[PDB]
């Protein structure tokens, strides 16, 4: 274990996760929510975050060379 970092998804990781997941949807990736008449590839990627169902892992690099991997499901969404 020994996770020394914060359990809150910071401001910058939320802006990069939403950008990458939106670009994957535009290239025909399978979605993971029951959308209703939604078409914008960035509006969908935002309601996947509200449902904690984005399949991406974040690797935080400590300044001594180590790292640890947090699943986006495990983080407390700031907003």
């Amino acid at each position: 274990q020994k996770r020394i970092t914060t359990p809150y998804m910071t401001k910058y990781e939320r802006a990069r996760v939403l950008g990458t997941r939106a670009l994957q949807i535009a290239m025909c990736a399978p979605v993971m929510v029951e959308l209703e008449g939604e078409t914008d590839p960035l509006l969908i990627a935002m309601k996947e975050l509200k449902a904690r169902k984005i399949p991406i892992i974040i690797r935080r690099y400590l300044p001594d060379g180590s790292y640890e991997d947090w699943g986006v499901d495990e983080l407390i969404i700031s907003d």
């Binding site: 970092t5 914060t6 809150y8 910071t10 401001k11 910058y12 935080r60």
Partner: peptide, 10 residues
Amino acid sequence: FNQAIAHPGE
């Protein structure tokens, strides 16, 4: 309070 802490990367 917990949302006043600085963000790691600014």
